[PDB]
Amino acid sequence: VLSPKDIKYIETMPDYILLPYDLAGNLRVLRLYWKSKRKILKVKSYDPETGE
Amino acid sequence: VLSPKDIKYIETMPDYIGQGADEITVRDGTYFFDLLPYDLAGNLRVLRLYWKSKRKILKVKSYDPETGE
Amino acid sequence: MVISINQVRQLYVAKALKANTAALTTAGDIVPKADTAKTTLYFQSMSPAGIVASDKINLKHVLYAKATPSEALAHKLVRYSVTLDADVSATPVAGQNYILRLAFRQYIGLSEEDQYFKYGEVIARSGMTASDFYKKMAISLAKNLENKTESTPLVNIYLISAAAASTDVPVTSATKESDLTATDYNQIIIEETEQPWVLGMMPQAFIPFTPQFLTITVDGEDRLWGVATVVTPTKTVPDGHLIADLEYFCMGARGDIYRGMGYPNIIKTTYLVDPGAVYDVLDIHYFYTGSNESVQKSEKTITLVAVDDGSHTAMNALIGAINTASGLTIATL
Amino acid sequence: FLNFPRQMLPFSKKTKQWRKDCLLWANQKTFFNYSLVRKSVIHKKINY
Amino acid sequence: DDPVRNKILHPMGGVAFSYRYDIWYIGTMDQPNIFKCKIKGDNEYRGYQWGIRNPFTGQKGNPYMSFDEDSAVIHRMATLGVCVLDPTRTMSLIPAILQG
Amino acid sequence: TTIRIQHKVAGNKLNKKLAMGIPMVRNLESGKQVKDTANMWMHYVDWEVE
Amino acid sequence: AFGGWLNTQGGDFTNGVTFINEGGSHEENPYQGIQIGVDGAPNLVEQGEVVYDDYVFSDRMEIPDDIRKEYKLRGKTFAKAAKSAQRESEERPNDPLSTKGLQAAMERIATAQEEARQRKEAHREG
Numbered sequence: 001v002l003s004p005k006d007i008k009y010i011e012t013m014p015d016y017i018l019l020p021y022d023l024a025g026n027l028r029v030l031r032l033y034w035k036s037k038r039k040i041l042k043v044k045s046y047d048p049e050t051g052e
Numbered sequence: 053v054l055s056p057k058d059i060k061y062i063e064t065m066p067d068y069i070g071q072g073a074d075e076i077t078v079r080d081g082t083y084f085f086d087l088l089p090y091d092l093a094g095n096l097r098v099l100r101l102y103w104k105s106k107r108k109i110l111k112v113k114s115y116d117p118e119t120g121e
Numbered sequence: 122m123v124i125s126i127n128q129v130r131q132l133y134v135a136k137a138l139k140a141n142t143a144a145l146t147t148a149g150d151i152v153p154k155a156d157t158a159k160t161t162l163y164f165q166s167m168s169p170a171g172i173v174a175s176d177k178i179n180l181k182h183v184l185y186a187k188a189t190p191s192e193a194l195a196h197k198l199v200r201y202s203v204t205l206d207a208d209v210s211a212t213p214v215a216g217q218n219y220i221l222r223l224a225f226r227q228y229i230g231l232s233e234e235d236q237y238f239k240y241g242e243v244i245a246r247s248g249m250t251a252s253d254f255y256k257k258m259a260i261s262l263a264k265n266l267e268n269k270t271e272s273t274p275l276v277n278i279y280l281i282s283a284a285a286a287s288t289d290v291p292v293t294s295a296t297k298e299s300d301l302t303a304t305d306y307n308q309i310i311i312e313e314t315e316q317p318w319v320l321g322m323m324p325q326a327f328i329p330f331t332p333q334f335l336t337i338t339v340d341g342e343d344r345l346w347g348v349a350t351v352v353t354p355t356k357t358v359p360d361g362h363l364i365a366d367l368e369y370f371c372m373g374a375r376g377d378i379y380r381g382m383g384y385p386n387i388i389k390t391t392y393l394v395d396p397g398a399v400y401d402v403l404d405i406h407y408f409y410t411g412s413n414e415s416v417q418k419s420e421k422t423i424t425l426v427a428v429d430d431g432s433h434t435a436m437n438a439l440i441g442a443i444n445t446a447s448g449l450t451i452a453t454l
Numbered sequence: 455f456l457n458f459p460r461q462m463l464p465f466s467k468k469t470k471q472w473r474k475d476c477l478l479w480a481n482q483k484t485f486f487n488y489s490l491v492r493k494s495v496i497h498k499k500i501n502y
Numbered sequence: 503d504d505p506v507r508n509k510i511l512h513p514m515g516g517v518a519f520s521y522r523y524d525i526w527y528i529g530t531m532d533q534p535n536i537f538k539c540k541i542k543g544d545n546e547y548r549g550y551q552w553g554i555r556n557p558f559t560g561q562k563g564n565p566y567m568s569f570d571e572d573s574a575v576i577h578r579m580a581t582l583g584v585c586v587l588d589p590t591r592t593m594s595l596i597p598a599i600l601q602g
Numbered sequence: 603t604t605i606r607i608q609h610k611v612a613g614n615k616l617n618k619k620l621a622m623g624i625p626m627v628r629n630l631e632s633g634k635q636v637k638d639t640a641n642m643w644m645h646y647v648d649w650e651v652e
Numbered sequence: 653a654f655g656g657w658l659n660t661q662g663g664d665f666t667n668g669v670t671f672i673n674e675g676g677s678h679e680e681n682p683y684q685g686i687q688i689g690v691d692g693a694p695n696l697v698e699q700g701e702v703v704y705d706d707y708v709f710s711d712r713m714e715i716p717d718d719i720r721k722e723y724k725l726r727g728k729t730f731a732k733a734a735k736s737a738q739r740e741s742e743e744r745p746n747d748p749l750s751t752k753g754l755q756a757a758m759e760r761i762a763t764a765q766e767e768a769r770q771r772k773e774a775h776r777e778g
Contacts (some may be wrong), residue, residue: 014534018545032480036468037461039058044653046672051689051706053660056462063462066481066561071549074608082496083547083579088563093488109749113533116603222515228506233506235632333515344515382623415570456645457560482652485545506633555613557644562616571615576651579606 122324133372197354213245364395521597
């Protein structure tokens with residue numbers, strides 16, 4: 001899922017052998033997870049065989 | 053059971069707060085400045101009320117057909 | 122126009138001094154009221170629909186009370202003396218194109234990134250004297266800038282002769298070579314113009330510029346042509362349009378906050394400032410403290426405005442009336 | 455942005471820039487929590 | 503060429519800062535010569551004091567009041583700097599009309 | 603170097619809907635005034651402070 | 653979908669009454685009905701009729717006053733009279749007394765509708 005532009009940003013990072021880098025040459029990776037709202041529909045369907 | 057008007061009240065609410073224990077700022081880099089429906093954390097006051105109401109019912113005396121009971 | 126406030130600003134127009142509330146007859150009257158124990162100052166002012174007062178100024182809680190003259194709020198329209206730089210050539214070099222660029226900076230939008238560029242042009246010829254040059258370039262600078270069909274007035278452009286050297290002869294799009302009959306022209310004066318002003322909707326704002334010259338070859342070298350020096354301004358716009366906008370904003374603090382939003386349905390406020398006269402400003406800036414552990418200041422200001430007649434008599438009577446009733450050291454300007 | 459971008463949306467309006475405006479908000483306004491059942495980070499770091 | 507900050511005009515047109523020549527990088531250095539010094543951990547303190555309402559966070563009803571007025575102020579602050587390790591690896595050329 | 607900012611609004615502006623007589627614009631980082639359509643006032647208050 | 657159901661607390665609770673809606677009349681539908689059941693194979697219902705215990709309360713008929721004063725109906729139609737006898741039991745579908753109160757009242761409108769069918773058939777054949 002990394003584009004070839006994003007491999008270059010990992011590649012062009014400064015050689016350290018708010019803050020995107022560490023002094024061990026690491027990358028700050030922020031994982032965010034949230035509970036969005038989604039629209040669903042409750043459908044009530046009479047089955048043709050029985051009526052349930 | 054929530055109406056889309058009631059989701060719009062849930063949606064427009066506090067969800068971020070700010071630093072906390074003109075403000076004088078102390079502690080250097082860790083700067084420290086020196087019945088209500090939200091919790092200053094992004095929560096909602098769900099008050100639930102349970103109560104015993106009164107219901108009018110009928111006690112009805114009937115007769116069994118096959119035996120006179 | 123919209124101004125900055127220190128948490129409020131309310132304006133009263135001092136059209137009269139009546140010394141008591143029983144003499145308030147016409148709209149716009151002012152009495153500075155205070156009691157014997159000089160602790161509260163307020164202004165019973167006659168509005169066009171009754172008598173109205175101000176918030177009650179605690180005279181232990183004033184911060185500054187300074188009255189300004191009407192000469193201190195006049196924008197001086199800047200000028201530029203465009204001449205021939207004598208170092209390159211005292212005479213116009215007889216083959217060159219003599220072009221001057223005006224770099225305007227507020228255009229139709231405020232930022233200094235909204236710009237506008239206008240030009241004047243004269244081909245210099247043999248035997249053309251410097252006075253025949255400024256007669257030829259002030260016309261060509263007026264045909265582009267003092268035109269009838271431009272969107273907004275940009276600059277006013279004059280000529281200055283060497284005999285009088287104090288009066289300016291105006292050059293416009295209709296002035297011909299035969300109207301400017303003088304042989305001792307020595308500069309071209311480029312002056313700012315007052316932009317159009319609409320009450321409350323179009324504030325008083327100006328268009329600056331810088332007369333920049335183009336390069337004309339002399340002995341092979343492409344030497345910049347002229348020099349432009351900022352001479353002292355002689356024309357100022359009055360205070361009529363800043364105080365007329367200042368009553369329009371500060372009436373929304375004491376009254377309706379919107380002004381025309383929906384026009385079958387508005388509260389028409391009657392305004393008291395003539396926009397065609399100059400006005401003095403007096404600002405009593407104060408605050409409101411309590412008696413608790415939560416005490417400190419809700420800062421306020423009251424603007425009083427009296428008419429200026431040349432020697433500030435209608436304002437100094439207000440200062441002389443506030444100084445006796447309240448006992449403050451407001452400087453009589 | 456003011457808050458977290460509007461979640462009560464149809465699924466087609468949750469475009470590439472709506473998701474990025476959500477994630478840019480977490481970059482900026484997510485450092486200070488009045489956690490109700492947790493201790494402070496400076497308190498926990500002292501314990502380790 | 504930004505004319506909002508650059509206000510002195512050059513005699514040949516444009517702003518005076520346009521005629522300034524800067525060679526930022528001369529050779530390679532094996533370490534970053536110019537870098538932006540930022541403190542580890544100093545996220546900017548988003549800080550609101552408020553009264554009974556908070557218009558930014560959207561909070562109606564305050565348990566801990568700073569004061570008693572309908573106000574909400576933001577206070578934010580950042581400690582920041584930069585560092586140029588070798589200013590001899592960087593040659594500039596400034597117009598003198600900017601007056602040094 | 604330590605910088606700071608400050609802005610103050612009343613508490614009346616919590617959910618003040620902007621009845622747009624003129625369309626309310628935002629100032630971009632580029633300098634351009636871009637148009638916006640958010641009806642709440644506080645969206646244009648924390649945007650001008652970042 | 654609100655038709656005789658109490659969709660609360662994540663669950664779907666019915667009192668037995670089936671509000672057969674959204675279709676249309678018999679003659680407006682392609683299929684000519686909602687075809688609730690094939691159990692007669694074309695068991696076809698319309699938008700107004702309601703069902704309790706596989707018994708269909710018709711919306712086409714009316715309530716005569718001779719069987720309004722007896723059997724004690726409240727609505728203008730047999731469908732609207734079964735839509736008013738279930739008003740108590742549609743909010744308390746797990747109640748023991750209300751499921752007795754609903755079953756007792758639905759048999760009355762069953763005997764009210766069946767008396768209207770035989771008195772109509774005697775009128776047309778007579």
